[PDB]
Amino acid sequence: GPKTLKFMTASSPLSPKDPNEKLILQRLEKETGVHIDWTNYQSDFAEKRNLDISSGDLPDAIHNDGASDVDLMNWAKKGVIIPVEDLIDKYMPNLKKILDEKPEYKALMTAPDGHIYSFPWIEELGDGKESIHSVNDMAWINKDWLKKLGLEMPKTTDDLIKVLEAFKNGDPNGNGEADEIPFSFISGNGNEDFKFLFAAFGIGDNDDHLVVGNDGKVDFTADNDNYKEGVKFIRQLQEKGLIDKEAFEHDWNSYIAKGHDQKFGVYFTWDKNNVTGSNESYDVLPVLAGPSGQKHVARTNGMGFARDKMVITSVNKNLELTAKWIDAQYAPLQSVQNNWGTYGDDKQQNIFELDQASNSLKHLPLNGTAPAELRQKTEVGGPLAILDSYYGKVTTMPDDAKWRLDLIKEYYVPYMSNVNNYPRVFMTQEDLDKIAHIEADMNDYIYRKRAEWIVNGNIDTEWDDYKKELEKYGLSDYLAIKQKYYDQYQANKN
Numbered sequence: 102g103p104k105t106l107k108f109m110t111a112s113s114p115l116s117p118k119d120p121n122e123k124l125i126l127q128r129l130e131k132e133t134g135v136h137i138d139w140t141n142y143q144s145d146f147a148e149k150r151n152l153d154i155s156s157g158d159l160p161d162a163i164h165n166d167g168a169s170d171v172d173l174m175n176w177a178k179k180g181v182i183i184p185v186e187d188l189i190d191k192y193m194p195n196l197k198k199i200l201d202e203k204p205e206y207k208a209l210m211t212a213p214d215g216h217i218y219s220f221p222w223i224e225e226l227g228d229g230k231e232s233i234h235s236v237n238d239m240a241w242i243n244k245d246w247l248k249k250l251g252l253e254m255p256k257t258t259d260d261l262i263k264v265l266e267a268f269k270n271g272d273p274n275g276n277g278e279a280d281e282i283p284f285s286f287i288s289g290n291g292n293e294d295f296k297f298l299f300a301a302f303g304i305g306d307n308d309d310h311l312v313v314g315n316d317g318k319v320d321f322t323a324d325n326d327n328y329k330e331g332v333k334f335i336r337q338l339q340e341k342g343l344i345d346k347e348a349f350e351h352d353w354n355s356y357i358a359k360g361h362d363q364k365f366g367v368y369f370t371w372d373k374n375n376v377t378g379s380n381e382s383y384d385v386l387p388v389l390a391g392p393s394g395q396k397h398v399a400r401t402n403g404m405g406f407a408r409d410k411m412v413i414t415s416v417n418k419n420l421e422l423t424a425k426w427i428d429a430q431y432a433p434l435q436s437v438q439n440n441w442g443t444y445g446d447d448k449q450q451n452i453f454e455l456d457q458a459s460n461s462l463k464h465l466p467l468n469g470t471a472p473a474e475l476r477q478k479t480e481v482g483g484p485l486a487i488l489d490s491y492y493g494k495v496t497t498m499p500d501d502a503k504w505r506l507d508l509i510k511e512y513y514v515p516y517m518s519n520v521n522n523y524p525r526v527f528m529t530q531e532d533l534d535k536i537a538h539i540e541a542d543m544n545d546y547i548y549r550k551r552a553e554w555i556v557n558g559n560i561d562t563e564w565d566d567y568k569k570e571l572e573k574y575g576l577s578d579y580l581a582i583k584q585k586y587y588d589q590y591q592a593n594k595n
């Protein structure tokens with residue numbers, strides 16, 4: 102009969118209480134000869150895991166763990182988890198092949214002490230500039246309104262102002278009311294913010310306020326003259342009555358209610374399908390030239406990467422067995438299914454069909470509750486890797502991802518002039534704490550001033566003191582830390 106290991110795991114409440122009732126894990130046990138005895142936490146995973154650690158009720162490994170860098174460091178320092186770099190080298194050819202094709206991931210996996218403490222989740226949907234993550238807050242425009250008013254798609258920021266004024270005053274939805282909301286967003290971090298447009302003024306902005314210049318120097322975006330010009334542009338929209346009166350107050354629920362009723366002229370989101378719906382009334386606002394005549398897209402620092410989806414505890418007495426079980430998860434067909442679902446179940450719907458001859462997966466069309474729930478019911482998460490080279494060989498790409506990737510490529514990639522973005526480096530505990538403190542102090546301040554400058558005005562007079570305030574919060578130290586890790590990554594990434 103099979104060898105045994107005890108794993109703690111995290112899963113969706115829609116999935117079975119015993120993970121071994123999943124088809125993926127049933128097949129896996131047949132292939133590996135290993136029976137997993139699961140401790141499956143389906144809610145409050147982090148708290149339940151932390152109580153187990155402080156009690157000394159440790160499993161052999163924690164699967165689908167998602168811990169922070171701070172957590173990994175603490176657990177390593179206390180000897181709760183062990184270094185695994187030697188286990189990779191000796192026992193894990195699938196993971197070694199990934200790290201050989203993509204040595205940047207090895208650098209991301211390695212702590213500054215030189216050890217690896219966890220096994221990552223890697224999901225590439227596009228590579229480099231073409232990554233689906235490169236732009237999060239895409240701008241969308243009402244093409245029905247443009248046609249009705251007989252307007253061309255704007256090419257410049259000044260054209261956009263003229264179009265928004267026509268949306269404001271022209272009653273493009275034809276109901277004789279001034280109900281059109283020309284420009285809307287949900288202010289701050291995330292997919293519904295306006296900061297995408299700042300790059301029209303040069304350099305631009307992202308949720309980290311950090312880009313990497315082609316000179317190799319990290320740049321804080323929110324103290325640049327370019328950023329001030331961006332803010333002054335959004336202020337112009339505000340002064341002209343073009344911004345949603347609730348843009349700084351509303352929540353996602355309110356935003357999508359107004360979106361569902363097609364009240365927006367121009368708005369921001371990840372995918373228009375979640376806001377204005379699956380229709381042709383809205384399309385991508387192309388990249389606009391600013392007053393300079395030039396076009397730019399700032400890259401986010403987003404990446405389909407999580408450092409820890411599995412750690413091995415200090416009580417594990419079967420390291421070779423464990424490493425081999427983990428390595429089976431990094432086989433390409435296994436990684437794809439673990440991430441997204443499986444094939445061949447006669448008792449419920451399937452995310453995939455397997456082509457027997459080619460041994461490759463194709464996404465199936467889904468019905469009923471399956472679009473909403475089937476992935477959560479059938480995926481397993483945990484450590485895995487899907488590389489951009491797998492698409493068309495091992496598996497199809499999800500249709501929605503493919504659609505978004507192609508828009509990114511068509512509209513944005515030509516204007517992403519930065520060779521690099523900022524890498525997801527693993528910092529020391531001391532640096533982690535310093536960076537956390539600085540961000541806790543300055544992040545809300547940056548957004549508060551930005552909002553005030555738009556709703557009240559006065560940026561020209563307040564700009565110099567604002568930059569001084571950022572330095573009081575430690576901006577120069579922040580940047581030196583970021584630059585230090587960037588430079589180290591350049592040395593280690595090959």
Ligand SMILES: [Ca+2]
Nearest residue numbers: 272276278280
């Ligand atoms: Ca109207």
Ligand SMILES: [Ca+2]
Nearest residue numbers: 320321324325
């Ligand atoms: Ca700067």
Ligand SMILES: [Zn+2]
Nearest residue numbers: 103130136137
């Ligand atoms: Zn069994």
Ligand SMILES: [Zn+2]
Nearest residue numbers: 137138139140
């Ligand atoms: Zn059990």
Ligand SMILES: [Zn+2]
Nearest residue numbers: 149152153158
């Ligand atoms: Zn417990």
Ligand SMILES: [Zn+2]
Nearest residue numbers: 184214215216
């Ligand atoms: Zn050591």
Ligand SMILES: [Zn+2]
Nearest residue numbers: 358359361362
């Ligand atoms: Zn509605």
Ligand SMILES: [Zn+2]
Nearest residue numbers: 225228488489
């Ligand atoms: Zn790749």
Ligand SMILES: [Zn+2]
Nearest residue numbers: 538539542574
């Ligand atoms: Zn402080």
